[PDB]
Amino acid sequence: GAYVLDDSDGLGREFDGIGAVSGGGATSRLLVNYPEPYRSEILDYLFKPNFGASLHILKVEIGGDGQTTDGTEPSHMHYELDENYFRGYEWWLMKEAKKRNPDIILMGLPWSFPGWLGKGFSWPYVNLQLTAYYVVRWILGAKHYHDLDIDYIGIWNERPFDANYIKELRKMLDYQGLQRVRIIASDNLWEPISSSLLLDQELWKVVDVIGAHYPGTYTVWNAKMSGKKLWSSEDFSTINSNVGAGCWSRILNQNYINGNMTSTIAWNLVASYYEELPYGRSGLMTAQEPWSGHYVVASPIWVSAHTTQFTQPGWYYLKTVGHLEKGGSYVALTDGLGNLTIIIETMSHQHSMCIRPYLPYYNVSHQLATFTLKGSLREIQELQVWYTKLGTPQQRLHFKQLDTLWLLDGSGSFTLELEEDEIFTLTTLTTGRKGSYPPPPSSKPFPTNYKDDFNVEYPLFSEAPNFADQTGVFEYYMNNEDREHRFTLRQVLNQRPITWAADASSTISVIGDHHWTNMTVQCDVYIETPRSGGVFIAGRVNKGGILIRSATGVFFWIFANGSYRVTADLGGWITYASGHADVTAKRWYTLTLGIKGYFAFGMLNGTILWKNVRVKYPGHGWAAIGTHTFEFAQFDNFRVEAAR
Amino acid sequence: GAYVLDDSDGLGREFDGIGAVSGGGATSRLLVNYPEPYRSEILDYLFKPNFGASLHILKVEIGGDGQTTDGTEPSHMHYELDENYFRGYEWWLMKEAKKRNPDIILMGLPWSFPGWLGKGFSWPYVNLQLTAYYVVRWILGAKHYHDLDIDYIGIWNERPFDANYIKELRKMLDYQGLQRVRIIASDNLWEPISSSLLLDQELWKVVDVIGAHYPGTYTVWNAKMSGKKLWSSEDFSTINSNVGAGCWSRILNQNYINGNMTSTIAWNLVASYYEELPYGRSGLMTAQEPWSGHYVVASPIWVSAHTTQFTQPGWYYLKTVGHLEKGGSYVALTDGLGNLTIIIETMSHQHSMCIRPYLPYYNVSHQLATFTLKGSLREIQELQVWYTKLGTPQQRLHFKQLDTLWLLDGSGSFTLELEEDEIFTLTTLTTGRKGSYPPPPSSKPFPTNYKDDFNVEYPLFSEAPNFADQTGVFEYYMNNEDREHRFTLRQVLNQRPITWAADASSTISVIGDHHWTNMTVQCDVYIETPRSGGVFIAGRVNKGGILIRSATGVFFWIFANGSYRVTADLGGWITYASGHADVTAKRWYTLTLGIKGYFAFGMLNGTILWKNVRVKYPGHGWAAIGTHTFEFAQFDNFRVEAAR
Amino acid sequence: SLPCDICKTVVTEAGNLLKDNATQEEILHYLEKTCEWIHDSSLSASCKEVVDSYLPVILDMIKGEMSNPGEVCSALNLCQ
Amino acid sequence: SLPCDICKTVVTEAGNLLKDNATQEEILHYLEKTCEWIHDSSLSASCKEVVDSYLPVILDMIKGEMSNPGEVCSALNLCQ
Ligand SMILES: *[C@@H]1O[C@H](CO)[C@@H](O[C@@H]2O[C@H](CO)[C@@H](O[C@@H]3O[C@H](CO)[C@@H](O)[C@H](O)[C@@H]3O)[C@H](O)[C@H]2NC(C)=O)[C@H](O)[C@H]1NC(C)=O
Ligand SMILES: *[C@@H]1O[C@H](CO)[C@@H](O[C@@H]2O[C@H](CO)[C@@H](O[C@@H]3O[C@H](CO)[C@@H](O)[C@H](O)[C@@H]3O)[C@H](O)[C@H]2NC(C)=O)[C@H](O)[C@H]1NC(C)=O
Ligand SMILES: *[C@@H]1O[C@H](CO)[C@@H](O[C@@H]2O[C@H](CO)[C@@H](O)[C@H](O)[C@H]2NC(C)=O)[C@H](O)[C@H]1NC(C)=O
Ligand SMILES: *[C@@H]1O[C@H](CO)[C@@H](O[C@@H]2O[C@H](CO)[C@@H](O)[C@H](O)[C@H]2NC(C)=O)[C@H](O)[C@H]1NC(C)=O
Ligand SMILES: *[C@@H]1O[C@H](CO)[C@@H](O[C@@H]2O[C@H](CO)[C@@H](O)[C@H](O)[C@H]2NC(C)=O)[C@H](O)[C@H]1NC(C)=O
Ligand SMILES: *[C@@H]1O[C@H](CO)[C@@H](O[C@@H]2O[C@H](CO)[C@@H](O)[C@H](O)[C@H]2NC(C)=O)[C@H](O)[C@H]1NC(C)=O
Ligand SMILES: *[C@@H]1O[C@H](CO)[C@@H](O)[C@H](O)[C@H]1NC(C)=O
Ligand SMILES: *[C@@H]1O[C@H](CO)[C@@H](O)[C@H](O)[C@H]1NC(C)=O
Ligand SMILES: [Ca+2]
Ligand SMILES: [Ca+2]
């Protein structure tokens, strides 16, 4: 089997880059509170050129206050007339990425929207101009407050598009001097966007890129025909084991070979969210322990390097790419300056299955491949070699540089012995590097004794560390008018968002160790809504993210009508205990909840309210705080002591 | 506590009887081919008075050719001009039940309907008259051909009702001289039937009984208010273990106590369908091995006896019924001829959970219950006692008669010592009997070497034994015009019926042992449709019933266009092998399919067509036959040899 | 009055669409194919099973409401 | 002509009805409730989880088709 590589008949499509997603939702949540130098080391493995994953693209969620997979992300406009360009962690992340790689490509995309944009409906297309103004404000803010140039803007993540909205968005962007910003649509399937572009000349003109999710390396006829750039704008979403690394390796090559896709973007960037939340450990690497500093440079990081360190957006694929006789594939790219990169993969079916979609069986066996460099490639005498072998610990080798290959015999030809689950990068480039930092601290569970008094005058981030909001939005709050409770944590949503997921009907933020079973939670609470207001503290909270509605545990609620209730569920369908209590609005109370084995008790201002209440056992989960509906409330002097 | 029982202030509601369902779907399939005396013994345990379950009601499915849970059931009208009142096994079952108990109550209800009836639509209410004539004809057929009086008629099982169809049905029945036949509606939830009856005087007049499914012992306000009889027209559906028996025990009492329900009907009568099909072993007893004669007189049989042997439709409940101080309940009934029956249950929450709906925790602890007989019940001085204890085999006493109680002290009072999971029947009746037959043969797997040449000239039943149709309908067929293939099996559906379940798009009948993994299937096949026709033989078929669409195995197909295909799925989405073959319509071919480990082969007329084709392994399932669509085809000389 | 007559005719047509023979099979095939997109090699059964277990009941339930056009229009405030 | 104008307004009323704020939560509650009827103590989680996962996507997808009333009417043979 001889495979010809040649540029004599011209070139293939322009390569657009490899990237990853931060968001959809709160995937980078636990990264922000990592101690130095570890936080900066992690960022280097992700973004530093000629080091680690050396990513070309960073795609971020434009927070809309709704639950978007592993938590909620704060919006720049919680209410109409509200504007704040310093909430959350996406601004910080984009700036950190840009510091390491100034040529990084930036993309923004909404999953949810604040409820006020709906004007009575849970729909973002009620006023096209208004929704476009909300999105464009985010782009302008990125530039004005953070010196960030957003390169691409999306429509509505995995949700219907409105052709008129897309057109209106283009008009709005141009009007605000953002003609350079490009539009990608529709961050869903190939259809109906592809056919819509063929039937509407005006829509065709305003859409720059067709972005499809989890395509399984293939495209559709209408998309090829559109003549637009085709990107796998969301892919991967698999556990970062060797299997996850194989999946990533295979699709990186075959998305172009099989589907003419010139960019692939992984969900997600780094697993910095509690592993027990949906799709745990599905990032290119792992960083879910800010309390310990422990992080894992997972296999997908090196699979990324095989392409990212040896290609750049603007290079061109050759016309000569394809599959191997006995399984696997090869791609080849040039920069038009005489450089050449060759990427070969032999991922076995059993060690490269992604979550989406279904992968049909294919055989891979030992083989030999001969490559011949025709055209201007013949003039190349030398190639650098990089190698990776995925599998068992006895046989895993990552991004190891091998002996240089020479083609001095004028033949312009070479041969390789290929086995299964291997990656080879053959490049003229000398800049390759397997980046290294000393090993980080060992893994350790979440602290068994933890407290946060929220007494931070000028916080770096909008929310206290380790609190992962699952419905509603919680923020640092300063109340000067009170000396006893000057610095608190406040739930700030006053209405349900235009939801992406099925958010709970009560707000909730989870924290700690999901393994915890016996625990004591304490918090000072303050109900802002007279008569109707309510708050809670909870333990053994077992579900979150897109499943937040399903959460069970032990919930201790107090209400401003002088009542209390103890429930088994966040939904409050199952009552453990209930009664009266001396509770009103606009008054500070200390709540204590103790859970041990089959029994629980609750305290109000250090006095027993209820005791020896039988609860389900065994049971385990996080500690939590929240409010009865989307209402204002404050929390202070949070404490938890637990046994795993 | 002292529990009073009295008839001085009058009586409660009239008791209507305890019953079971045969159908929805093919639940009695494997009973018909049991050898004697076992078949007759099973029937006695079910229907013989003062013996076993001694059932008051038998509810049957009116076959509509569609898949209705564990298979398809044949209709009396496959086509508009087709009428046959001798297909299937429901006629036979009703006659067998009636022979044992002439006072048994008979009910009929459609799940599916044949296609033709819809007149181009998948809706039964297209022509209200044609649908009513189709149904009423069955009821008349039941009398004219089998001398059976159908007492009750339903609408459409767990599907929407049409008030105008319900009105047409009454008219139709009356017009055909069936004024005695009563209507039960709507075999779904309490609503919208209950409120519809309150808003429509005309509908109220034509509906005799409100029949609800899996009510969880409760009714609704509108149903109580209607003044109609309320029945749990479908309940139970739980594995016939001690847990299943507890569920049945508890609901039998509490459906009346909590929901004013005067009848409870269990799905299903007897588990005579492959256990690996949906809801396996969910009958009052088990009879799933006609090849061995092995049957199991399960616990629910004796739980039934506690009521059925000591009550009869027409008896009245007393006003004095209720719950016990430390958990459990008691009901009491009279015939108004001096007889009295008292049924007590103490089913623990953990040992009485049904499949539907959700059962909330309740405690059951040891207690003493004193019973005093006021009114005309005070004249009673002698009561017979029957006892049951459900649990582990060590503490397992079914329907054991205890020492006779004497209330000679004029007090008209007695006390009982009550533990958990116990049933007591206290009756004046002397007729009680724990029926007994010698133990049936031991359980044995389906024969490893099996053949059926279908050479039955005048079969007793419409289909060959052990073939369980999962899509389409297969019947014995005689073709005199051919001597080599005079007696065959034929798929007779030529169109998709008005489906209750999600039937496959190809017809299929499964047979054998679901545990089989290595097997050789052989069958002579005959394609009736020119050009477009297709048939198959299969092995390792894993799923059936309601999930027949998802079924996977090794399917060997041959089409009248001169082609073949080997698939991993019934849907044919996954191809193992494909190619050309010397195959046409209206010609007999012998198909052989061999499956062993990772490899399979196929033969056409003893000649290899394909060999060493790699298949998924491990894998296990039944053998099967079928057709590409709803089309005519014939099968002959069926053979299977397998290893479990 | 007059929009009441037209409203009733629209509901009728929409009903007749879901009532078409082809409709059930066409929906199952769409939904089973989306199952291959939603999940991998192992969990392709769960998804497909859920679809073949509830789709009939859901579709037939909707056909039930489309069968009373007067009632639909009354809720849409085009009849009463 | 005239039934095309009425048809379009019917699709809009229904479309706006599903688009009401209260609609999502209402549907969630209904299906989450029916999950207690369909399954017992153990399997009440599976049903509820499936509901909270796919209803969002399904409901919002329908709201999309209702958003083009002309297209709906064209398929209903009241417009073209
Ligand atoms: C969380 O709290 C529960 C409640 O106390 C803990 O469970 C209890 O653990 C103790 C000690 O491990 C068990 O006691 C032992 O009982 C056996 C006889 O059953 C006896 O031989 C021993 O000497 C000792 O007394 C107790 O049974 C157990 N209770 C239950 C209901 O399981 C649990 O261990 C705590 N978990 C954590 C992680 O802290
Ligand atoms: C169904 O057929 C398959 C295919 O033959 C059977 O599996 C095979 O069983 C044999 C004997 O049990 C296995 O061979 C053994 O291999 C080991 C080394 O691995 C060797 O030490 C032994 O002396 C012997 O040669 C064979 O590996 C196995 N094949 C596979 C793929 O599992 C299976 O047992 C049959 N099942 C039934 C119920 O009949
Ligand atoms: C999209 O990619 C496909 C390949 O997946 C291209 O189709 C052909 O690919 C073979 C090799 O697999 C080449 O020999 C052919 O020359 C390709 N066709 C053509 C017309 O060049 C397909 O061309 C690509 N489409 C676009 C729009 O570039
Ligand atoms: C391969 O790519 C490198 C990287 O761009 C090229 O090197 C650059 O060459 C340009 C002129 O062609 C100079 O202005 C840059 O300063 C060079 N940069 C570096 C880091 O070397 C190189 O020309 C390409 N071709 C070969 C054969 O190496
Ligand atoms: C339906 O059954 C309920 C009980 O489930 C009856 O309601 C009352 O039940 C208590 C005992 O549980 C008695 O003390 C009351 O006297 C009952 N009410 C009446 C009006 O007698 C209810 O009566 C029954 N409904 C019908 C229509 O008979
Ligand atoms: C209890 O029920 C039995 C069964 O019906 C009654 O016995 C019947 O009594 C009638 C007259 O009342 C006779 O015509 C039947 O021949 C009797 N049948 C049998 C089998 O005994 C009995 O009267 C009822 N009362 C008591 C106190 O036993
Ligand atoms: C894979 O290919 C090799 C070589 O062609 C062969 O030996 C092996 O049996 C094949 N495996 C499968 C499962 O097809
Ligand atoms: C059940 O009741 C008994 C007696 O009142 C008591 O000892 C036991 O603890 C109770 N169990 C539960 C789980 O409530
Ligand atoms: Ca504070
Ligand atoms: Ca024969």
Numbering used by the authors:
A (entry chain A), B (entry chain B): 25 to 668
C (entry chain C), D (entry chain D): 1 to 80
Copied sentences from the primary study:
Importantly, mutation of the GALC-associated saposin SapA can also cause Krabbe disease. To remedy this deficit we have solved the structure of GALC in complex with SapA, defining how saposins solubilise lipids for processing by soluble hydrolases. Here we reveal molecular details of how glycosphingolipids can be bound by SapA and presented to the active site of GALC for catabolic processing.
Based on these insights, the GALC–SapA complex was formed at pH 5.0 in the presence of the detergent LDAO and the X-ray crystal structure of this complex solved and refined to 3.6 Å resolution. At the optimal pH of the interaction the GALC and SapA surfaces demonstrate extensive charge complementarity, explaining the observed pH dependency of the interaction. A cross-section through the structure at this position shows that this hydrophobic patch encircles an opening in the SapA dimer surface that lies directly opposite the GALC active site. In our structure the monomers are head-to-head, with all termini together at one end, while in the published lipoprotein disc structure the monomers adopt a head-to-tail orientation.
